Amino acid sequence: IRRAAYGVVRYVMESGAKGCEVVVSGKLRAARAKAMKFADGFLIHSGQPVNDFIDTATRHVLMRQGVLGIKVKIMRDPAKSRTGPKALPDAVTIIEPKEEEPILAPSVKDY
Amino acid sequence: GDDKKELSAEKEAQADAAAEIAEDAAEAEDAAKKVELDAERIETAEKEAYVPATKVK
Amino acid sequence: KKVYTTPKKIKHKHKKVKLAVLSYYKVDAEGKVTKLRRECSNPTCGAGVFLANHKDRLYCGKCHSVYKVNA
RNA sequence: ACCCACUCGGCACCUUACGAGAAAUCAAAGUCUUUGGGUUCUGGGGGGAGUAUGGUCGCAAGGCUGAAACUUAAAGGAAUUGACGGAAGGGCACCACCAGGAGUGGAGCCUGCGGCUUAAUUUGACUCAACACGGGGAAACUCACCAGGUCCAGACACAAUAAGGAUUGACAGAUUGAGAGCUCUUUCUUGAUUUUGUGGGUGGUGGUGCAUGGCCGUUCUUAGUUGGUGGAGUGAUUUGUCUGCUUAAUUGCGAUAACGAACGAGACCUUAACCUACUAAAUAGUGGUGCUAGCAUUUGCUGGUUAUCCACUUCUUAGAGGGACUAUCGGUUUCAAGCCGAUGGAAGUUUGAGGCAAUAACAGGUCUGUGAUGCCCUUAGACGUUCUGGGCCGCACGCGCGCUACACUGACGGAGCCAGCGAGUCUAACCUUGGCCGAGAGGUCUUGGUAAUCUUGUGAAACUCCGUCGUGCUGGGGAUAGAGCAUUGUAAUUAUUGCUCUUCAACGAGGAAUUCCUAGUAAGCGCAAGUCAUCAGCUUGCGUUGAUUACGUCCCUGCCCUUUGUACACACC
Ligand SMILES: [Mg+2]
Ligand SMILES: [Mg+2]
Ligand SMILES: [Mg+2]
Ligand SMILES: [Mg+2]
Ligand SMILES: [Mg+2]
Ligand SMILES: [Mg+2]
Ligand SMILES: [Mg+2]
Ligand SMILES: [Mg+2]
Ligand SMILES: [Mg+2]
Ligand SMILES: [Mg+2]
Ligand SMILES: [Mg+2]
Ligand SMILES: [Mg+2]
Ligand SMILES: [Mg+2]
Ligand SMILES: [Mg+2]
Ligand SMILES: [Mg+2]
Ligand SMILES: [Mg+2]
Ligand SMILES: [Mg+2]
Ligand SMILES: [Mg+2]
Ligand SMILES: [Mg+2]
Ligand SMILES: [Mg+2]
Ligand SMILES: [Mg+2]
Ligand SMILES: [Mg+2]
Ligand SMILES: [Mg+2]
Ligand SMILES: [Mg+2]
Ligand SMILES: [Mg+2]
Ligand SMILES: [Mg+2]
Ligand SMILES: [Mg+2]
Numbered sequence: 001i002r003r004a005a006y007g008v009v010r011y012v013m014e015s016g017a018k019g020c021e022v023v024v025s026g027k028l029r030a031a032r033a034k035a036m037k038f039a040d041g042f043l044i045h046s047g048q049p050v051n052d053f054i055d056t057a058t059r060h061v062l063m064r065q066g067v068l069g070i071k072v073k074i075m076r077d078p079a080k081s082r083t084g085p086k087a088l089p090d091a092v093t094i095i096e097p098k099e100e101e102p103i104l105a106p107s108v109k110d111y
Numbered sequence: 112g113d114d115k116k117e118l119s120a121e122k123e124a125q126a127d128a129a130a131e132i133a134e135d136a137a138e139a140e141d142a143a144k145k146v147e148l149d150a151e152r153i154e155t156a157e158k159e160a161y162v163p164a165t166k167v168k
Numbered sequence: 169k170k171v172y173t174t175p176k177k178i179k180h181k182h183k184k185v186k187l188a189v190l191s192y193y194k195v196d197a198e199g200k201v202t203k204l205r206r207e208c209s210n211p212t213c214g215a216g217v218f219l220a221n222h223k224d225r226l227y228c229g230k231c232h233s234v235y236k237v238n239a
Numbered sequence: 240a241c242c243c244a245c246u247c248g249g250c251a252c253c254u255u256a257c258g259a260g261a262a263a264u265c266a267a268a269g270u271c272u273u274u275g276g277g278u279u280c281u282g283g284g285g286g287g288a289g290u291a292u293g294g295u296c297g298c299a300a301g302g303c304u305g306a307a308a309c310u311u312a313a314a315g316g317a318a319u320u321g322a323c324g325g326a327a328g329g330g331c332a333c334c335a336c337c338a339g340g341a342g343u344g345g346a347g348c349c350u351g352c353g354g355c356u357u358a359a360u361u362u363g364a365c366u367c368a369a370c371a372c373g374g375g376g377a378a379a380c381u382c383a384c385c386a387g388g389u390c391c392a393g394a395c396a397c398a399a400u401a402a403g404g405a406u407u408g409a410c411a412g413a414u415u416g417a418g419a420g421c422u423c424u425u426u427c428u429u430g431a432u433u434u435u436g437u438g439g440g441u442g443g444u445g446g447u448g449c450a451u452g453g454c455c456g457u458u459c460u461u462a463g464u465u466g467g468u469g470g471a472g473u474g475a476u477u478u479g480u481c482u483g484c485u486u487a488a489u490u491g492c493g494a495u496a497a498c499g500a501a502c503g504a505g506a507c508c509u510u511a512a513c514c515u516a517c518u519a520a521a522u523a524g525u526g527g528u529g530c531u532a533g534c535a536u537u538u539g540c541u542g543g544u545u546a547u548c549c550a551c552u553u554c555u556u557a558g559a560g561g562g563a564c565u566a567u568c569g570g571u572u573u574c575a576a577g578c579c580g581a582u583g584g585a586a587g588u589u590u591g592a593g594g595c596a597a598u599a600a601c602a603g604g605u606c607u608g609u610g611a612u613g614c615c616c617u618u619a620g621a622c623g624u625u626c627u628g629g630g631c632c633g634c635a636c637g638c639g640c641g642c643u644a645c646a647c648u649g650a651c652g653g654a655g656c657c658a659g660c661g662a663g664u665c666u667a668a669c670c671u672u673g674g675c676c677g678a679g680a681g682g683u684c685u686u687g688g689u690a691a692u693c694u695u696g697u698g699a700a701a702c703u704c705c706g707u708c709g710u711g712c713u714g715g716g717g718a719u720a721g722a723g724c725a726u727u728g729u730a731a732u733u734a735u736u737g738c739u740c741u742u743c744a745a746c747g748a749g750g751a752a753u754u755c756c757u758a759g760u761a762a763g764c765g766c767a768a769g770u771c772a773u774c775a776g777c778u779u780g781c782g783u784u785g786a787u788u789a790c791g792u793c794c795c796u797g798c799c800c801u802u803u804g805u806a807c808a809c810a811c812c
């Protein structure tokens with residue numbers, strides 16, 4: 001259960017994602033229901049960027065015991081958007097100033 | 112899974128992703144009985160396959 | 169639930185009686201064939217089908233029901 | 240007697256820790272694997288058991304000395320995180336109160352639940368989080384219930400049967416609710432498609448939501464969760480993540496062995512507001528001109544004319560931009576975050592209203608949404624499926640959401656006459672203007688619309704206006720009930736709905752209790768959509784008329800927060 005999930009989180013991550021998330025719910029060799037999360041990286045959960053940047057899909061894997069639920073969540077690097085807001089609305093980047101050379105008495109040039 | 116064997120999980124999962132990354136990169140550069148069944152009934156539509164005669168009394 | 173009320177006398181389906189089929193092809197004297205059980209005249213029944221004989225009855229079975237001929 | 244300095248010997252306390260400890264802590268519990276100052280005593284896993292036995296002391300009660308067999312994988316200690324408490328300290332909220340508003344609780348009916356009744360009255364759900372909920376407004380269908388009738392749509396594999404016929408069908412009659420060949424009488428037909436048996440499948444609103452997915456509801460009208468470097472602990476862990484202040488908010492300020500960060504809050508997104516600024520529009524509208532009718536005349540006032548032309552974009556429409564950032568100023572406060580007042584502004588309550596919403600929990604609900612599914616039951620006299628009829632509406636009563644009222648801020652009759660969100664017909668009968676016929680309901684003839692184009696300006700309802708009535712269960716109220724006419728539908732009986740006349744009940748503002756709510760909100764008021772053949776007293780949205788009272792607090796209640804206790808961790812079920 002972990003090897004298969006943990007590997008998928010690695011292939012998604014290795015493929016340039018900002019974050020991933022895998023949920024397995026159901027019953028697996030025991031009689032009682034359990035559920036694990038496998039999530040590495042960065043993922044937002046609220047607001048419009050959800051519609052923009054995270055991809056959700058659930059699948060029902062039907063096994064001889066019962067039926068598990070696979071849920072996957074992939075968060076794409078917004079910098080590569082290529083048709084979008086290129087970042088999260090939180091991103092407030094300041095440009096850095098440049099060192100100036102002071103006083104230098106007036107000395108106007110000509111052309 | 113028990114956390115007592117978790118190391119052997121993250122390694123065999125990574126090794127899986129290693130194989131999934133090789134199959135993904137090797138598949139990036141890798142290496143007629145016509146007879147017209149719909150018309151074979153119109154081709155073999157020749158005669159000598161019937162019989163019809165009736166109406167006595 | 170409330171298993172098994174069932175007022176008695178179950179029902180049987182059918183038999184389709186054995187009836188070693190037509191000997192009703194009357195010959196006279198070697199070897200004329202005089203053909204008992206007159207046939208039907210419906211164009212879908214090419215005279216190979218015959219007519220049953222009940223009272224006031226000459227029924228064509230090949231017609232699943234049709235064309236009640238009366239003689 | 241008191242003060243100051245010292246010194247012995249006291250009972251203690253404070254800070255440190257070199258040092259010690261499993262830690263809690265300890266100037267001894269320190270000067271121990273770098274293991275030795277003298278000496279006394281006890282203990283060797285937990286029960287059994289301080290029991291049995293003997294000895295001895297005692298008046299007694301009992302004291303001292305004191306086993307074993309057997310049983311058992313733990314018992315135990317200190318600390319950490321949780322979860323819980325009928326402990327303490329703090330907070331937050333009209334699903335809490337305060338100040339009130341409008342009420343429900345009384346009544347008639349509508350509706351749902353229990354109960355009873357029944358051939359059946361299918362069933363899920365029971366504090367907030369069951370009870371106008373399952374989009375659950377069921378005449379058939381639906382449909383799961385009950386009384387009965389058909390059908391296999393029982394794959395496939397082997398075997399049996401069998402071309403001298405494996406099997407199929409049916410006229411009429413009987414029969415049956417039935418023009419079901421269901422079954423039987425009769426006897427034609429059918430041709431290897433079936434039948435029979437076993438194995439194996441299949442269907443099922445059968446069971447299990449305490450086997451599951453998925454989904455949803457609840458905690459949550461909440462504010463919580465985590466990692467990098469550093470500080471503490473042998474360690475699980477901890478500090479960060481905090482007394483206070485501030486906020487709707489772990490929202491910030493500030494204090495600070497922490498520094499700086501991310502998920503969640505915020506940002507964001509949709510909607511309602513502002514543009515005489517940009518781009519435009521015969522499916523949106525304005526002015527002018529023709530053409531045109533009426534009343535005035537002295538030039539005027541009020542209409543007609545999907546294209547007779549010219550121009551424009553204020554109103555309408557939706558594209559791109561703009562705008563707000565709690566701005567300016569002044570109060571208040573650690574002059575910090577903020578907060579209150581005034582000016583301005585379309586807008587200054589997170590601008591108003593939503594959408595999205597981390598980690599975790601629940602044996603919450605849903606196998607009756609699913610050809611989502613484990614297992615179990617059933618599977619041909621069926622728990623499959625279809626057909627006929629009945630039932631889910633059954634009525635001594637208990638409960639919940641509602642509807643309509645008890646009237647004169649009113650009914651009634653004329654008259655004025657104003658919205659907004661929607662929806663509407665192809666292989667079809669959806670939204671419907673208009674003209675007639677009809678008291679009405681409706682009927683009939685046509686027509687526009689696949690829609691900013693036609694219905695529709697949806698001329699909606701309260702409301703405004705002039706009369707009639709006069710406080711009398713009255714002309715308030717419209718339950719109940721009789722007779723008649725229409726519409727939906729194959730069917731209306733237990734009366735689908737609509738109209739008409741008649742019948743004219745209870746109810747005189749409602750006990751104890753209890754819901755909801757702070758501005759275009761409450762309440763009053765209708766309308767569109769969902770459902771829908773017909774049926775809204777329901778819901779989801781919309782606009783119309785438009786208040787009173789708060790702008791506070793922790794008393795009630797509900798929940799968060801620390802503090803604290805724990806022998807709980809399957810965590811007070
Ligand atoms: Mg948000
Ligand atoms: Mg110490
Ligand atoms: Mg707080
Ligand atoms: Mg308040
Ligand atoms: Mg009050
Ligand atoms: Mg009251
Ligand atoms: Mg049938
Ligand atoms: Mg079989
Ligand atoms: Mg069997
Ligand atoms: Mg099913
Ligand atoms: Mg459950
Ligand atoms: Mg569930
Ligand atoms: Mg149950
Ligand atoms: Mg509130
Ligand atoms: Mg804390
Ligand atoms: Mg965020
Ligand atoms: Mg404009
Ligand atoms: Mg002002
Ligand atoms: Mg339960
Ligand atoms: Mg389900
Ligand atoms: Mg039926
Ligand atoms: Mg019902
Ligand atoms: Mg309700
Ligand atoms: Mg009136
Ligand atoms: Mg008439
Ligand atoms: Mg037309
Ligand atoms: Mg009246």
Ligand SMILES: [Mg+2]
Pocket residue numbers: 743
């Ligand atoms: Mg009266």
Ligand SMILES: [Mg+2]
Pocket residue numbers: 748
């Ligand atoms: Mg009152």
Ligand SMILES: [Mg+2]
Pocket residue numbers: none
């Ligand atoms: Mg309707």
Ligand SMILES: [Mg+2]
Pocket residue numbers: 371376777
């Ligand atoms: Mg309903």
Ligand SMILES: [Mg+2]
Pocket residue numbers: none
């Ligand atoms: Mg504790």
Ligand SMILES: [Zn+2]
Pocket residue numbers: 208209210213217228229230231234235
């Ligand atoms: Zn015939």
